[PDB]
């Protein structure tokens, strides 16, 4: 006894209709739960018995039955609605679904740009790291390159990307560019290039600086 | 008035064993069925196992049978599920949770369907035979020549630990505006490494003191370090 979610992930806009589907193998009568997941979170029930809306739950959230098939409704979606929502069906085994995650969609954002140097304790290791800060974009994808002397790097960076900001619905972003003391000793200038559109920035320090 | 509150996860060598503690308050644990829930990193919901003191029922995830042993204690209004042969598929964020259907009726044969409707705030359990490290910490530090959007931006690197998690916190937990702490991400050499930063106004770069708290609970560390422009 399966349950087959859909869609896996979907963005809308604020106040967008938003429509999750469950599909179970079965008959699983009406005992099927619908959860509202924020990342590293519990999970939150929002509906029980297929249709019944959970205390607390705000009255945007609905849940519908059409024989095998269940639906979670979301009459206006809101920018703290971003989540990954997972239908459950209530008889043993428990089997829960897929999940459905919810990105929001809104205007484009310009990113705040900032780049770190290695800090001198760090140089004491025998290893650098340069950060590059992208601050409150949208959307997610967004063009990082790094330069060093002003030859493009490759393979040496990591990227890791925040969750969506609960009233704005942006994102921030770092870069990591990891380098040996000696490798980096032995440049001087670093610079972090941002490609959104129309419009990159490029933001860099020299190594002697202050 | 109602809560859960897990302990017991951590860091276990692969085939060893765990014991996982759910203290519930405001409810009793025989009223109710308790149930574990599992989430592998990335991965979906899955339910592992269940129990009710008062018909001394338990179940289990087939995936688990055997391994996994689900019980309580009434004098302590406590469940435990305690993990043995620990498995790398075993590694996992493991929730407690109360389904919200009471066993309202006092007799015996009456199935009750399950919906989750007070959780635990999850526990990570890690199967790896790895070592535990504490995190480096380096300041991440601004320039007043470095201005993006009429703000100046700091940070805290915290580098090369396992297992997860940190907790990073600024100025004691008295700064919170600003703060983006990234999700952790793992490096090549197999340890993890994570920045929090912070947007503050230009002017207060030099005059305000910015200090980054990072918890290790794993390694049970905690570090302070200030964070300042670099002044040579
Ligand atoms: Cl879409
Ligand atoms: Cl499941
Ligand atoms: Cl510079
Ligand atoms: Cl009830
Ligand atoms: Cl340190
Ligand atoms: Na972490």
């Known amino acids: 006894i399966q349950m087959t979610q859909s869609p896996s992930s979907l963005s809308a806009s604020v106040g967008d209709r938003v429509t999750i589907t469950c599909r179970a193998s079965?008959?699983?009568?009406?005992?099927v739960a619908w959860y509202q997941q924020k990342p590293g979170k519990a999970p939150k029930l929002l509906i029980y018995?297929?249709?019944s809306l959970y205390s607390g739950v705000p009255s945007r959230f609905s849940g519908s039955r059409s024989g095998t098939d269940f639906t979670l409704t979301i009459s206006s979606l809101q920018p703290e609605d971003f989540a990954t929502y997972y239908c459950?069906?209530?008889?043993?085994?428990?089997?829960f679904g897929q999940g459905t995650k919810v990105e929001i969609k809104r205007t484009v954002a310009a990113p705040s740009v900032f780049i770190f140097p290695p800090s001198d304790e760090q140089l004491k290791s025998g290893t650098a790291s340069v950060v590059c800060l992208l601050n409150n974009f949208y959307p997610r994808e967004a063009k990082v390159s790094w330069y060093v002397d002003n030859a493009l790097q490759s393979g040496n960076s990591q990227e890791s990307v925040t969750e969506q900001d609960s009233k704005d619905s942006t994102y921030s972003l770092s870069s990591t560019l990891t380098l040996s003391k000696a490798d980096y000793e032995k440049h001087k200038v670093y610079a972090c290039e941002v490609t959104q559109g129309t419009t990159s920035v490029t933001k860099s320090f020299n190594r002697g600086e202050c | 008035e109602v809560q859960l509150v897990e302990s017991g996860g951590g860091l276990v060598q692969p085939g060893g064993s765990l014991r996982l503690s759910c203290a519930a308050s405001?409810?009793?644990?025989?009223?109710?069925?308790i149930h574990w829930v599992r989430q592998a990193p990335g991965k979906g919901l899955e339910w592992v196992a269940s129990?009710?003191?008062?018909?001394?029922?338990?179940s289990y995830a087939d995936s688990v049978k055997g391994r996994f042993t689900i019980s309580a204690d009434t004098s302590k209004n406590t469940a435990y599920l305690q993990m043995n042969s620990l498995r790398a598929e075993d590694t996992a964020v493991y929730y407690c949770?109360?389904?919200?259907?009471?066993?309202?009726?006092?007799?015996?044969?009456?199935?009750?369907?399950?919906?989750?409707?007070?959780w635990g705030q999850g526990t990570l359990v890690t199967v790896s035979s790895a070592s535990t490290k504490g995190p480096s910490v380096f300041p991440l530090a601004p320039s007043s020549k470095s201005t993006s959007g009429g703000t100046a931006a700091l940070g805290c690197l915290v580098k090369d630990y396992f297992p997860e998690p940190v907790t990073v916190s600024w100025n004691s937990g008295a700064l919170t505006s600003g703060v983006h702490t990234f999700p952790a991400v793992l490096q090549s050499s197999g340890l993890y490494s994570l920045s929090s930063v912070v947007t503050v106004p230009s002017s207060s770069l030099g005059t305000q003191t910015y200090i980054c708290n990072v918890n290790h609970k794993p390694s049970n560390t905690k570090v302070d370090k200030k964070v300042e422009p670099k002044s040579c």
């Open positions: 079965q008959s699983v009568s009406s005992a």
């Open positions: 129990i009710s003191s008062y018909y001394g029922s338990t």
């Open positions: 405001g409810f009793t644990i025989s009223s109710s069925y």
């Open positions: 949770a109360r389904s919200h259907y009471s066993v309202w009726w006092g007799w015996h044969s009456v199935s009750y369907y399950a919906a989750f409707d007070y």
């Open positions: 018995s297929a249709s």
């Open positions: 459950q069906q209530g008889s043993a085994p428990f089997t």
